[PDB]
Coordinates of C-alpha atoms in Angstrom, one line a residue:
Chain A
X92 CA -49.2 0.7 -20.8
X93 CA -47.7 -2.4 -22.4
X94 CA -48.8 -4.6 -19.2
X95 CA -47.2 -3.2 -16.4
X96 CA -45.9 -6.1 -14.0
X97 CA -45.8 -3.3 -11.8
X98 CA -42.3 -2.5 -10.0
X99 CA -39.6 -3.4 -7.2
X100 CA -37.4 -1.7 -5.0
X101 CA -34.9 -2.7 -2.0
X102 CA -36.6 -2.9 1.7
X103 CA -34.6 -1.1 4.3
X104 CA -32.6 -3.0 7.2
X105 CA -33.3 -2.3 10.5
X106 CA -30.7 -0.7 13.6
X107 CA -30.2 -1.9 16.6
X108 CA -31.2 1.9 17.5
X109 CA -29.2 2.7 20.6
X110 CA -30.8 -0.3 22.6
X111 CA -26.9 -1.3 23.8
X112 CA -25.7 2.4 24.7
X113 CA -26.0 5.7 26.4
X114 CA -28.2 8.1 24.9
X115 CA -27.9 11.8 26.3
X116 CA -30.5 13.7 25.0
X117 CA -29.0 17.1 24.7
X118 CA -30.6 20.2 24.1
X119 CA -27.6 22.0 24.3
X120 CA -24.3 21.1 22.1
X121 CA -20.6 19.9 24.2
X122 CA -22.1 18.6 26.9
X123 CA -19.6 17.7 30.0
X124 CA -19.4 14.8 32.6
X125 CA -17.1 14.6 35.7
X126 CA -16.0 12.0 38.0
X127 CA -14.5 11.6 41.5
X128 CA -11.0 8.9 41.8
X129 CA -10.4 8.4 45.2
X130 CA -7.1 8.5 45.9
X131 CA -4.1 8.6 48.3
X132 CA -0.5 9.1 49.3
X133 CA -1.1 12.9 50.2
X134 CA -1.7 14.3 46.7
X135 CA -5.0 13.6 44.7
X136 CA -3.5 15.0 41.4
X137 CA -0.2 13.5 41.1
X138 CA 2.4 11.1 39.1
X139 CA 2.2 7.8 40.8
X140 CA -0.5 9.0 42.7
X141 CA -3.2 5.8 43.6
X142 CA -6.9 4.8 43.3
X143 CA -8.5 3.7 46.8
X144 CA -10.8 1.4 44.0
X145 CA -10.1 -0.3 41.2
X146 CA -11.9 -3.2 39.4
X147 CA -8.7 -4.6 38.1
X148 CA -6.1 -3.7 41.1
X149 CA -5.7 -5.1 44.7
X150 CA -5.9 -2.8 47.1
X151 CA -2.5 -2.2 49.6
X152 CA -3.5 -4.1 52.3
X153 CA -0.8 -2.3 54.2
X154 CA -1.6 1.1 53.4
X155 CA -3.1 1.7 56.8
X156 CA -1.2 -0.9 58.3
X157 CA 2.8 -1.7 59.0
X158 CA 3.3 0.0 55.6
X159 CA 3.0 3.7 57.3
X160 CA 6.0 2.6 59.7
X161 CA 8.5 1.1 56.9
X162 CA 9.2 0.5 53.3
X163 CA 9.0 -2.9 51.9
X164 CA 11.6 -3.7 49.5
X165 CA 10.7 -4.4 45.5
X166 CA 10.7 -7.8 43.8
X167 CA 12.9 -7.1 40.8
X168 CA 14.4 -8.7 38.0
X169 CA 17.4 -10.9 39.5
X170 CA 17.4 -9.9 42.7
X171 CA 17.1 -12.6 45.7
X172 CA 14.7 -12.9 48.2
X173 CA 15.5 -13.5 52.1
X174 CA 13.4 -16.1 53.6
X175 CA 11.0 -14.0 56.1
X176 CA 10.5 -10.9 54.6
X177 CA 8.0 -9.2 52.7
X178 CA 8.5 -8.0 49.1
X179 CA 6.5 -5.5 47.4
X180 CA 4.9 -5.2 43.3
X181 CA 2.5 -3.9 41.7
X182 CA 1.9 -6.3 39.0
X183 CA 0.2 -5.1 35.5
X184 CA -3.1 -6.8 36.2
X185 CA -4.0 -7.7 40.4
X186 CA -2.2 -4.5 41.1
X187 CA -0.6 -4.4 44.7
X188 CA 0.3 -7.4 46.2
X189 CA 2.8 -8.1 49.4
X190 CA 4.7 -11.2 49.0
X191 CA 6.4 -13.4 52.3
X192 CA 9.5 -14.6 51.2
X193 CA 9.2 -18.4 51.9
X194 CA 13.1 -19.2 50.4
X195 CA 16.0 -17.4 49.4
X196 CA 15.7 -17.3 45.8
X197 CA 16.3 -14.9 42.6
X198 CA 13.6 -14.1 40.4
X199 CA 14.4 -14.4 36.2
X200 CA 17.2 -12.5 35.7
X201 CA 17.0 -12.2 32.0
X202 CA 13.6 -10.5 32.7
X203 CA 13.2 -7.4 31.0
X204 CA 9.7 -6.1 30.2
X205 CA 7.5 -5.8 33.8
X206 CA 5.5 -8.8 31.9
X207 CA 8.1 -11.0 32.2
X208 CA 8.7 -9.8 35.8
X209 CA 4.9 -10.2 36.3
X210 CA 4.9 -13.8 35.1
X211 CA 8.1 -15.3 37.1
X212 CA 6.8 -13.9 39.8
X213 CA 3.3 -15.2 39.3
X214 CA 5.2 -18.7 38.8
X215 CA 7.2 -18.2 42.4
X216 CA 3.8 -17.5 43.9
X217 CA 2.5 -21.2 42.2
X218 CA 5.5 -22.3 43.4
X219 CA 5.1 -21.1 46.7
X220 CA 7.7 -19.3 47.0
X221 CA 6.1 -16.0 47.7
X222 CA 3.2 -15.8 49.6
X223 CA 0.6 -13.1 49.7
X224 CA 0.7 -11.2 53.0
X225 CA -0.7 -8.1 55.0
X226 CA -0.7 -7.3 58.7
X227 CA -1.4 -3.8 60.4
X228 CA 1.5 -1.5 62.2
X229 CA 2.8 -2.6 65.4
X230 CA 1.1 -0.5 68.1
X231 CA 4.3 0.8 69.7
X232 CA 4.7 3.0 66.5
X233 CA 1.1 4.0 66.1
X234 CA 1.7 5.2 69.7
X235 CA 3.6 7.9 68.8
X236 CA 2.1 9.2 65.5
X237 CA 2.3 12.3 64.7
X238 CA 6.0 13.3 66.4
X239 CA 4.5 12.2 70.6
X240 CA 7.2 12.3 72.9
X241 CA 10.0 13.4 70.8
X242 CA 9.5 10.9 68.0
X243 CA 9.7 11.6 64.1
X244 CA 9.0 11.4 60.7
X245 CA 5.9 9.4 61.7
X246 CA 2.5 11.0 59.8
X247 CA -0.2 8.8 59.1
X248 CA -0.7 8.0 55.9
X249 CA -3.6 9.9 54.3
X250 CA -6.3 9.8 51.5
X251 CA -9.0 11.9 49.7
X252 CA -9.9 12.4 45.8
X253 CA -9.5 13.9 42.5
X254 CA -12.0 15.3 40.8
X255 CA -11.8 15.9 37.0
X256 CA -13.9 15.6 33.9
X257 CA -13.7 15.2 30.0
X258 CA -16.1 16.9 27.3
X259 CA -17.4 16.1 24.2
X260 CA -18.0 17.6 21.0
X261 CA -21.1 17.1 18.0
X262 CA -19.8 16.3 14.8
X263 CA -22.1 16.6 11.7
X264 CA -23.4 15.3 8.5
X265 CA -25.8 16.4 5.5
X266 CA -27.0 15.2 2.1
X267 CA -28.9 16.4 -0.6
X268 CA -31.0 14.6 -3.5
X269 CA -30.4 17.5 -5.8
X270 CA -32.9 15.9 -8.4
X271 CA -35.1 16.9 -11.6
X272 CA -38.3 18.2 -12.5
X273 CA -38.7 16.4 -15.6
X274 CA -37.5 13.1 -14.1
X275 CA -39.9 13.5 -10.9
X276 CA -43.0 13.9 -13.9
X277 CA -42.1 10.6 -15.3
X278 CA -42.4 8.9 -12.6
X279 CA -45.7 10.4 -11.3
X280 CA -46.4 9.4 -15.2
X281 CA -45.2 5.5 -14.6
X282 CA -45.5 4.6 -10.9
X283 CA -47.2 7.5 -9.7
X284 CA -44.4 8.6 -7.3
X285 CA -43.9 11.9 -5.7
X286 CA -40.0 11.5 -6.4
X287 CA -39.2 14.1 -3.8
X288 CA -40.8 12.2 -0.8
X289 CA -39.2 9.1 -1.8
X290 CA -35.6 10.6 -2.1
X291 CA -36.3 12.3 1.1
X292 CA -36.9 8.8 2.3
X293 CA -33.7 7.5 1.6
X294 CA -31.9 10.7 2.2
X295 CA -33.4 10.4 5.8
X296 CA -32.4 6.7 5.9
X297 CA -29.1 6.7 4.9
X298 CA -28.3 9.3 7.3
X299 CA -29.5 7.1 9.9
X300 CA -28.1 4.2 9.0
X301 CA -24.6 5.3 9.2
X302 CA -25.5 6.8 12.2
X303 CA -26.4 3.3 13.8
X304 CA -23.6 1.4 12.2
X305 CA -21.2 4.3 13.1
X306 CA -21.9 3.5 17.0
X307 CA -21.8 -0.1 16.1
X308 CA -18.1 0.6 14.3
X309 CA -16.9 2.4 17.5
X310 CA -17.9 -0.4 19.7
X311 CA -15.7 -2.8 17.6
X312 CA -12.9 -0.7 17.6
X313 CA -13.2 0.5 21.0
X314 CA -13.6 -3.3 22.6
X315 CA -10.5 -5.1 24.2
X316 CA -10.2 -8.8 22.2
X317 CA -11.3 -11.3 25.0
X318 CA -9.7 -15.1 24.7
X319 CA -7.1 -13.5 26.0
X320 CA -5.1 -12.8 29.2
X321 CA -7.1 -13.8 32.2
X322 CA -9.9 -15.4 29.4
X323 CA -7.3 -17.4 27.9
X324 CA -6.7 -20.8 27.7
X325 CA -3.2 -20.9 27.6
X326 CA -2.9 -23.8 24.4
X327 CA -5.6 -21.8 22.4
X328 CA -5.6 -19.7 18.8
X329 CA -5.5 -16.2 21.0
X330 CA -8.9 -14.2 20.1
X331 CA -10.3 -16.6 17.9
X332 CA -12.9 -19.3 18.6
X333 CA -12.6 -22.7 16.4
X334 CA -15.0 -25.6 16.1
X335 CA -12.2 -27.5 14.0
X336 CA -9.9 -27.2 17.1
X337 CA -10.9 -29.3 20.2
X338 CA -8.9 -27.3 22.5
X339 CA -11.7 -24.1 22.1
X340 CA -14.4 -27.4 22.5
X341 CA -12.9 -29.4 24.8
X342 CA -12.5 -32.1 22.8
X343 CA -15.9 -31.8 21.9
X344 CA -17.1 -34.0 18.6
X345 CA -21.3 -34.1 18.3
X346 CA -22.6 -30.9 17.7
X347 CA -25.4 -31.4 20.4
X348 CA -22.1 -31.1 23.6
X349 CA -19.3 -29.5 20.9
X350 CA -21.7 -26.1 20.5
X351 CA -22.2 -25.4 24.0
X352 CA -18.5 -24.4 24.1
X353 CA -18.9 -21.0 22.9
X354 CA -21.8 -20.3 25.2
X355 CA -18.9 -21.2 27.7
X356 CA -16.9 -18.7 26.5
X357 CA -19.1 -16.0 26.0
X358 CA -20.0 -15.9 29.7
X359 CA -15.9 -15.9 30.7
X360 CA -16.0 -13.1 28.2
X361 CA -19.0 -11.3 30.0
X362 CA -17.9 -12.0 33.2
X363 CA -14.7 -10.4 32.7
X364 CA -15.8 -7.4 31.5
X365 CA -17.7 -7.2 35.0
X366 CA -13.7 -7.9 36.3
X367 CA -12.9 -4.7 33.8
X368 CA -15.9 -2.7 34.6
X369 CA -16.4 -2.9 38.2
X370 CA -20.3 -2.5 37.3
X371 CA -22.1 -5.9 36.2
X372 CA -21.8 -9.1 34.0
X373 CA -22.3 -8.3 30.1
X374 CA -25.8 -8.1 29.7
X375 CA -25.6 -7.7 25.3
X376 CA -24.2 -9.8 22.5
X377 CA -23.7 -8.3 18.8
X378 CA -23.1 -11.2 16.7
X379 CA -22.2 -12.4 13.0
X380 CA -25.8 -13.8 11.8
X381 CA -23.9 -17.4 11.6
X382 CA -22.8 -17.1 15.2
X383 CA -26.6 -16.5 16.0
X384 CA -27.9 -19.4 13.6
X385 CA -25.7 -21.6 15.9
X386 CA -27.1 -20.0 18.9
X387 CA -30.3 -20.5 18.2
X388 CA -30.1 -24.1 17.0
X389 CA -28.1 -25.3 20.6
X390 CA -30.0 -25.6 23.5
X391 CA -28.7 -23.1 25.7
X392 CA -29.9 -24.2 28.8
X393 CA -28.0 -26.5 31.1
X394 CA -28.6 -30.5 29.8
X395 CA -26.7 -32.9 28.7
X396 CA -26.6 -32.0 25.0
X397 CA -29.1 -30.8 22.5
X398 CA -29.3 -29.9 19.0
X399 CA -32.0 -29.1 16.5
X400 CA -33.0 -26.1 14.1
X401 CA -32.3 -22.6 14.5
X402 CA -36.1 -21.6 16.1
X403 CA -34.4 -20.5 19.2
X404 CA -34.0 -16.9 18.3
X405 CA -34.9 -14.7 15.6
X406 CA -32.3 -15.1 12.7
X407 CA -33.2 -12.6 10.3
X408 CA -31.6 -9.6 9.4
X409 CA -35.1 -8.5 7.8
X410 CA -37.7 -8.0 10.2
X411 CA -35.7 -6.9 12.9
X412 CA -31.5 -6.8 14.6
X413 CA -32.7 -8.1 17.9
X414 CA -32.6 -11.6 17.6
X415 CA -33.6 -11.8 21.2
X416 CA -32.4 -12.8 25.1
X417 CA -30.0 -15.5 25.4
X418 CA -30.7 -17.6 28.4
X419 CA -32.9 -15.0 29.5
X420 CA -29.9 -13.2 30.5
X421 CA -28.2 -11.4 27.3
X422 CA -29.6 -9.4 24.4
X423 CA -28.6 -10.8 21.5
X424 CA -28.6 -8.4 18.2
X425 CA -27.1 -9.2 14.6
X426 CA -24.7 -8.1 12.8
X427 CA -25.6 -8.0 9.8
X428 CA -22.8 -6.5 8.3
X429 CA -20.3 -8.4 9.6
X430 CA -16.9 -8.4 8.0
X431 CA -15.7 -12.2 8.4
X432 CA -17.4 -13.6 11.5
X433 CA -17.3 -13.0 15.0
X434 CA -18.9 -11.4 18.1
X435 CA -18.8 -8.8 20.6
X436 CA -19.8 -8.3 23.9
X437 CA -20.6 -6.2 26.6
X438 CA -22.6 -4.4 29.5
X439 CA -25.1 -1.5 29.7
X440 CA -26.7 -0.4 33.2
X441 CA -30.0 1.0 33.8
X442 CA -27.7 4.4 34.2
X443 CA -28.2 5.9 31.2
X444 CA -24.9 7.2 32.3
X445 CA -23.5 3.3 33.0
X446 CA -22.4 1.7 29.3
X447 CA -19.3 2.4 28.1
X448 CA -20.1 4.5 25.2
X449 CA -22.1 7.1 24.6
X450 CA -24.8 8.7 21.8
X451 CA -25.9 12.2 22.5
X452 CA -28.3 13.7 19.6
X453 CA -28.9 17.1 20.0
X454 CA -30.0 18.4 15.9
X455 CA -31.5 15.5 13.8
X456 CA -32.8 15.1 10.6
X457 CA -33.7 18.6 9.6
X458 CA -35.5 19.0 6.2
X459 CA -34.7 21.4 3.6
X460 CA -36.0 22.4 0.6
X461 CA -35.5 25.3 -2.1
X462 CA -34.8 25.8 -5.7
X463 CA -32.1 27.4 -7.8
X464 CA -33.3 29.9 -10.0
X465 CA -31.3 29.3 -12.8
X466 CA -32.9 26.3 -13.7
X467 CA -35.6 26.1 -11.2
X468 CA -34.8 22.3 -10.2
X469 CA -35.6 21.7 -6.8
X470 CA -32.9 20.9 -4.1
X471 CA -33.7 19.2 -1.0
X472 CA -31.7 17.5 1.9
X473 CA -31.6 16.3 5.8
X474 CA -29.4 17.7 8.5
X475 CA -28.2 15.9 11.6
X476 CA -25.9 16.8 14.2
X477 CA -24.7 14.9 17.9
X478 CA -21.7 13.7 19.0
X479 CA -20.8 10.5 21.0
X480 CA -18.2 10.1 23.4
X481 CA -16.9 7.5 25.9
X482 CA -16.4 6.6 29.4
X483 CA -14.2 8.2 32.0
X484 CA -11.9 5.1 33.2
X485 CA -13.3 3.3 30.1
X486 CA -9.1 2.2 29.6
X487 CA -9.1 1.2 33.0
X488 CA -5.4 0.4 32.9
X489 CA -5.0 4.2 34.2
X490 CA -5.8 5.3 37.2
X491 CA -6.5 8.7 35.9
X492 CA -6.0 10.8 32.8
X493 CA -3.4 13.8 32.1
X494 CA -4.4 17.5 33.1
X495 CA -7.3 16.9 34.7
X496 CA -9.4 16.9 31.6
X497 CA -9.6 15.0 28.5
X498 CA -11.9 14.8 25.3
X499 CA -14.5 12.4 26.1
X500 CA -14.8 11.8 22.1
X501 CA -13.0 8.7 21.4
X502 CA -10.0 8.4 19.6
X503 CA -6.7 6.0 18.8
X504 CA -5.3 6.7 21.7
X505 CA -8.0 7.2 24.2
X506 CA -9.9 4.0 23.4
X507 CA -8.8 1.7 20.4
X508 CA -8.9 -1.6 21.6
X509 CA -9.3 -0.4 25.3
X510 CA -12.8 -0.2 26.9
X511 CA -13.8 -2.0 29.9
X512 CA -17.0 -2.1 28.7
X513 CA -16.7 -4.6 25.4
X514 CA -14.8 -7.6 24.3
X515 CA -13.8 -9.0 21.0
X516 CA -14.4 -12.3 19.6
X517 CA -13.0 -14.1 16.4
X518 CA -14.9 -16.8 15.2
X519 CA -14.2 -19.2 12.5
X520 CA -14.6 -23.0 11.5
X521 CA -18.8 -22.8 11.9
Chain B
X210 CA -7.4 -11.2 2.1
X211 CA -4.4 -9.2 2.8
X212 CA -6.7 -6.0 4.4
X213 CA -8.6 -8.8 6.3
X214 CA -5.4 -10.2 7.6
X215 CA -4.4 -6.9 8.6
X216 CA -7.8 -6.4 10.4
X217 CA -7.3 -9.5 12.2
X218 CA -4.2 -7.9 13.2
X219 CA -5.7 -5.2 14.7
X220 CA -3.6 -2.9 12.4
X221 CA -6.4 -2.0 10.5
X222 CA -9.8 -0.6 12.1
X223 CA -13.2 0.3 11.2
X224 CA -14.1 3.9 11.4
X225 CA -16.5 6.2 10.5
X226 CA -16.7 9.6 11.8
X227 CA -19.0 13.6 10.9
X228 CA -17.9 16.6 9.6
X229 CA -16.8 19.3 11.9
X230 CA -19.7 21.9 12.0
X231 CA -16.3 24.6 11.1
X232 CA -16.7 23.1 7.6
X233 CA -20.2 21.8 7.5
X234 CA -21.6 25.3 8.1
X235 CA -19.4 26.7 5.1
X236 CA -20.4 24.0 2.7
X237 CA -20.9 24.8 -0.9
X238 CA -18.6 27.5 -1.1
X239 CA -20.5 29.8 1.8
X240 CA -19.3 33.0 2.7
X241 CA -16.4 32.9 0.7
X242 CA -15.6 29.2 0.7
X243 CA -14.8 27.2 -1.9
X244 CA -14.3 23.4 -3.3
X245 CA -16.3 22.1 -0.7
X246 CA -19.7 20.7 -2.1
X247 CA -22.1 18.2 -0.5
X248 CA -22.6 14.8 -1.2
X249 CA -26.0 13.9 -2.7
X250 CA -28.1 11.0 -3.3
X251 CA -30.7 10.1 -5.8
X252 CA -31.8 7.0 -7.8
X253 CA -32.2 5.0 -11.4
X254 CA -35.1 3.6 -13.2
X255 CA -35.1 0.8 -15.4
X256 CA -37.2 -1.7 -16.9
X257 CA -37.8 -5.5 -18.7
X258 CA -39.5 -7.5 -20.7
X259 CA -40.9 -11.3 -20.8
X260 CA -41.1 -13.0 -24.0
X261 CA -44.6 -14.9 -23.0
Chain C
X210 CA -23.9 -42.2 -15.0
X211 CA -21.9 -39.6 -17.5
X212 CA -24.9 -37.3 -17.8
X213 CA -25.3 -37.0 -14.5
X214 CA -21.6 -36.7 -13.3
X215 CA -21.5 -33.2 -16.1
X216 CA -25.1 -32.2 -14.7
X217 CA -23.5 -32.4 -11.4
X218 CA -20.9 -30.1 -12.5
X219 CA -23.0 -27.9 -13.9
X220 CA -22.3 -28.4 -17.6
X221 CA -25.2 -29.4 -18.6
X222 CA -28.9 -28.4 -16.5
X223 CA -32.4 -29.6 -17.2
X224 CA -34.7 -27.2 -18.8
X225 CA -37.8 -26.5 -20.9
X226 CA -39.9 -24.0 -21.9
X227 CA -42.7 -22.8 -24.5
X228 CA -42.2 -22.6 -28.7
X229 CA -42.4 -18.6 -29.4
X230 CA -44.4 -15.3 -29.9
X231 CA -42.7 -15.4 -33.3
X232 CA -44.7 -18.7 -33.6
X233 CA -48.4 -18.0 -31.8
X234 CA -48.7 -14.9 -34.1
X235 CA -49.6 -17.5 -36.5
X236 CA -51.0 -20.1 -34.3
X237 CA -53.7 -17.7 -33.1
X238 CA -55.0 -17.2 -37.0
X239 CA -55.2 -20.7 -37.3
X240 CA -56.6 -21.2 -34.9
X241 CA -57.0 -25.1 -34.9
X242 CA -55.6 -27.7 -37.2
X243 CA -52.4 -26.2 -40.0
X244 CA -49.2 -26.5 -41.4
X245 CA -46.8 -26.1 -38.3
X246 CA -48.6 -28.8 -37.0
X247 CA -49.1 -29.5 -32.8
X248 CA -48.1 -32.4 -31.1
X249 CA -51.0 -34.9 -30.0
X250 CA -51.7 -36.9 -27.3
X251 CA -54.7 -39.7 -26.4
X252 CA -54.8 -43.6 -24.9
X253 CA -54.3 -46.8 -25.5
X254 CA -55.8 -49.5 -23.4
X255 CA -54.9 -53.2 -21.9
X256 CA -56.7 -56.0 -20.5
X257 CA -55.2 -59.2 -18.9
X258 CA -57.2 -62.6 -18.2
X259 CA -57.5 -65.0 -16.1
X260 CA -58.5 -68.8 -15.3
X261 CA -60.3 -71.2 -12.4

């Protein structure tokens, strides 16, 4: 004992645990959820089939109105309008709209995708050329619904629902420490460990770790990226948020006024995702730690302009994640393994079924121990097993899936870059 | 900077994902199985000295 | 000026520490006054005067 100055070792990080998610306590694996789509045009389960609701769509004002008696024509590319009439399209985003023709005019000619459609048309309805419009049937058809006094071909249109449903799956995952008697005797000898507990410790650990930073991973690559479409300002960078560029700041100079911008931002970003969701504004921020050292240095209230030292919310990735509630209103939780620098959002409900994604333990962290004879060294190792999945209309952009069921597990083409629930942020120049 | 630009991009995303219990229950060559071993953790020791 | 601009640069950075083991292996057997002799310190003094 040449004077021990005694030993160190690495502290373990904390998890955001599953504070910004579904949990699902199984007790049983491949669990199931369904869902009911209401829908119309005589056939719940159909191509072309629609949603009575939709958080992203306008619904067809005419549907029960002068729409049952006749067919509006389509806008389309290069075809002209005729002042007094009523076009129909249902745009990529706002869904169906009826538009009054208030000239006689063609729309883009050289459009090709239905976003270039979408836009002239958008820029005709700025223009005012085409106006939105509904009105109901004119009672002298109604009259005879349903073939009265020799009429025909004059059903009222009808509506019900679809009711379908995805599953999920539990995936797996095991270690072992596979370790040595005559090691685990030196240590007893030196620091006085056990050198099986401590192993089991960090077998345990790193189990869990990946587990949290698994669910963390999926909500990354499952978010849409917001500064974007509808959250876009149209002279901006496209997902990324500058400090160096005064059209993300407004021309902002003076930290105190230029910081608040993002705040700005963040709640476009979170009320969107209520726009996506149809459920509630984002209510949870996962953020780079410098993200959150300029959040909690800017006042975040509403006043003219403040700055001072980060002491608004925790900053440390070493006590805790949770950073804490920003404006009283969003939980605010590090990433402390961020990549570059950045931030996402989202919303959770109180329904444990309400978040967007989905954890669902059902084995965890099973011990086990033996020995193989032919050496005798011990073996020992942890066990967990659960499965996460995602939720129905999560895309949104669909009304409904294919078949009338779907793995609920996520995957490239069910959710990357896709759910409702989450947006992306980029965030540089801090 | 090139995978980071490609992240950025959107071409490249983070994943992480378990084993399929139809492997995980036969792992380590079980009933009949083979080249399919677990991965396994332990630790190192070491030490220094101060000149006083 | 100079010294400071490489210090700046890192070139050149301020340090000190003790003489040596190598050396209080024989200091200790001294244990006072010898040939590998310690630097000394004390005081002087001053006074200034005055007139009416």
């Amino acid at each position: 004992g040449p004077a021990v100055m005694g030993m160190v070792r690495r502290a373990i990080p904390n998890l955001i645990a599953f504070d910004i998610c579904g949990v699902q306590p199984m007790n049983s694996p491949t669990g199931q959820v369904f869902a009911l789509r209401a829908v119309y045009g005589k056939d719940p389960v159909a191509a072309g089939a629609k949603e009575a609701f939709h958080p992203m769509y306008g619904p067809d004002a005419m549907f029960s109105g002068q729409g049952a008696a006749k067919k509006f024509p389509a806008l389309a590319a290069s075809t002209q309008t005729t002042v007094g009439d009523i076009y129909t399209h249902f745009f990529q985003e706002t869904g169906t709209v009826y538009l009054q023709a208030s000239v006689q005019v063609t729309i883009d000619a050289g459009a090709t995708d239905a976003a270039k459609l979408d836009a002239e048309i958008k820029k005709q309805m700025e223009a005012g050329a085409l106006v939105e419009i509904a009105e109901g049937m004119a009672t002298s058809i109604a009259e005879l619904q349903e073939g009265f006094n020799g009429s025909t071909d004059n059903p009222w249109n009808e509506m019900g629902f679809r009711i379908d449903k995805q599953v999920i799956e539990a995936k797996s995952r095991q270690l072992k420490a596979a370790y040595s008697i005559e090691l685990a005797q030196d240590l007893r000898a030196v620091h006085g460990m056990d050198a099986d507990a401590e192993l089991s410790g960090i077998l345990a650990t790193e189990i869990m770790l990946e587990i949290n930073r698994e669910v963390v991973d999926w909500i990354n690559y499952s978010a849409q990226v917001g500064k974007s479409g509808m959250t876009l300002t149209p002279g901006s960078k496209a997902g990324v948020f500058d400090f160096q560029d005064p059209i993300d700041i407004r021309g902002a100079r003076w930290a105190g006024e230029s910081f608040k911008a993002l705040l700005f931002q963040i709640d476009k970003e979170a009320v969107e995702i209520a726009r996506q969701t149809g459920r509630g504004e984002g209510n949870f921020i996962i953020a780079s730690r410098n993200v959150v050292n300029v959040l909690a240095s800017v006042d975040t209230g509403i006043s003219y302009a403040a700055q001072g030292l980060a002491t608004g919310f925790s900053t440390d990735t070493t006590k805790s994640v949770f950073a804490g509630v920003l404006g009283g209103k969003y939980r605010v939780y590090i990433d402390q393994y961020a990549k570059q620098d950045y931030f996402t959002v989202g919303y959770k409900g109180p329904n444990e079924m309400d978040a967007g994604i989905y954890y669902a333990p059902y084995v965890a962290l099973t011990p086990l121990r033996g020995s193989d004879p032919k050496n005798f060294q011990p073996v020992m190792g942890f066990k967990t097993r659960y499965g996460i999945g995602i939720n129905p209309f999560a895309e949104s952009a669909a009304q409904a899936p294919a078949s009338r069921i779907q793995s609920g597990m996520p995957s490239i083409l069910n959710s990357l870059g896709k759910n409702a629930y989450f947006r992306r942020v980029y965030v540089k120049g801090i």
